[PDB]
Amino acid sequence: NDLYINWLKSLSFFQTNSSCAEALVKVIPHYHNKLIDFSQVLQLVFSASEKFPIQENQPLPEQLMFLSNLEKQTPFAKAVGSSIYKLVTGKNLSLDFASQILKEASILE
Amino acid sequence: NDLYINWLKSLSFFQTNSSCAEALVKVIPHYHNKLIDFSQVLQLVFSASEKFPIQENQPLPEQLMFLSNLEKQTPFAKAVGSSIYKLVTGKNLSLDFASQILKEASILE
């Protein structure tokens, strides 16, 4: 709620991409009005991102060990890991970087 | 009520998707037994939709612009818009098309 949002704002990935902030500021209202849900907030916020290590054609075994691990995460971490995985497949976001964002959120929760 | 059901059945999105029609059939009983409200009926029914335009990747601006417009809609139109936005973000349902569906429900109301 206000909780998952704070945790989101606590993320280092979030803090290094000012575009994500300008996004959360302009999206959080519709989340308060119950127009959209947290999953949507994350997709909309992380879609504005633009700065992160890139790795093309990342190996399948690593991808799968990241997903088996994400599959076992706690609520908040899972939603973030999954949203970020979108960036890994569609924008080549380095898998290790994703693994760190997940680790970090894994702790905040 | 036996008014929203009719408004729902009036939407082209509903008429062009027989799947939504079947859904409504299986879902409405729980609505009558009062386990779910109509906003829920809307979500469930639309989750069954299959036919619609898929605009992949819609710039954040367009999104926020559609949400603030949805924000000031009437009750039924707000409910219909919110359920459809789920598809927008989760299935890349065209924002234009979405706007259309929302206009039509805005009218019936």
Swiss-Prot record, chains A, B:
It is found in: Nucleus; Cytoplasm, Cytoskeleton, Microtubule organizing center, Spindle pole body. Transmembrane segments: none annotated. Ago1, chp1 and tas3 interact to form the core of the RNA-induced transcriptional silencing (RITS) complex. The RITS complex interacts with the RDRC complex via interaction between ago1 and hrr1. Clr4 has a role in mediating this interaction. Has a role in the RNA interference (RNAi) pathway which is important for heterochromatin formation and accurate chromosome segregation. A member of the RNA-induced transcriptional silencing (RITS) complex which is involved in the biosynthesis of dsRNA from primer siRNAs provided by the RNA-directed RNA polymerase (RDRC) complex. This is RNA-induced transcriptional silencing complex protein tas3. The chain holds residues 436 to 544 of 549 of the full protein.
